[PDB]
Amino acid sequence: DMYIERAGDITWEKDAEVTGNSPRLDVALDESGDFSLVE
Amino acid sequence: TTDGVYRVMTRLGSTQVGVGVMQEGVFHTMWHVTKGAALRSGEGRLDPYWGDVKQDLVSYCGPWKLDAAWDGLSEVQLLAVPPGERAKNIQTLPGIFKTKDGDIGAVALDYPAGTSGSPILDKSGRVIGLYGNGVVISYVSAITQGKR
């Protein structure tokens, strides 16, 4: 069985770690909700 | 029922299958996390109210409440709730999924699968979408938002 447990407030944190790129990707979304790359 | 971010757990032992957002009395997560199953919250039960496989979203106890959207320019924060770790904020500039139907923000962050449903926040603290439906190029998640 599936259950939920509170883990925190929804808040922005001023001291957050910062990481990751910002790629621009062409994609398609199919009926099953799956994204795939397009060329 | 308290507003906040929550782990979605299953049971021999317990495993974290995802995350979701309680806001305005409604629980929001990704369809692939729960497959629409009812959820326990203490002694109470949360039943699904709306869901859509193509958007990969589901709401419990009422209609989808989250409506903010990425502004297309600003950094955002993934409020990641990884299995076995405290909730933590990861700031990033989204990239973009370009589709035939318009552009969707995307975050190039690769967290454990049990992190799916974690909210992505704008600078005001509003939830602009949920993490965990995406593509591999590294994994890149759409910023998936529903309709209020």
Numbering used by the authors:
A (entry chain A): 50 to 88
B (entry chain B): 18 to 28, 31 to 156, 160 to 170
The paper states:
Here, we present two crystallographic fragment screening campaigns using a 96 fragment sub-selection of the European Fragment Screening Library (EFSL) provided by EU-OPENSCREEN. The performance of this subset was validated in two fragment screening campaigns using the model system endothiapepsin (EP) and the NS2B–NS3 protease complex of the Zika virus. EP is an aspartic protease with the catalytic dyad formed by Asp35 and Asp219 and has served as a model protein for finding inhibitors for other aspartic proteases like β-secretase, a key target for treating Alzheimer's disease. As a second and real-life target, we addressed the NS2B–NS3 Zika protease which is crucial for the viral life cycle of the Zika virus but with its shallow active site challenging to target.
The protein construct contains the soluble part of the membrane bound NS2B co-factor and the protease domain of the NS3 protease/helicase protein of the Zika virus. The NS2B–NS3 Zika protease is a heterodimer, the NS2B co-factor wraps around the NS3 protease domain and forms part of S2 and S3 pocket. For the second fragment screening campaign LigandFit and PanDDA were used to identify binding events. With this campaign 18 fragments were identified as crystallographic binders with a total of 22 binding events. Out of the 22 binding events 10 fragments are binding in the S1 subpocket of the active site close to the catalytic triad forming π–π stacking interaction with Tyr161. For expansion of the fragment hits seven representative hits close by or at the active site were selected. Fragments EOS102546, EOS102659, EOS102811, EOS102592, EOS102818 and EOS102869 form π–π stacking interaction with Tyr161. Whereas the second binder, based on fragment hit EOS102818, EOS90861 keeps the initial binding mode exactly with an RMSD of 0.37 Å between the MCS of fragment hit and follow-up binder. Compound EOS90861 forms a new H-bond with Asp129D and interacts as well via π–π stacking with Tyr130B. The compounds EOS41783 and EOS90861, as well as the fragments on which they are based, were assessed by TSA, but no temperature shift was observed.
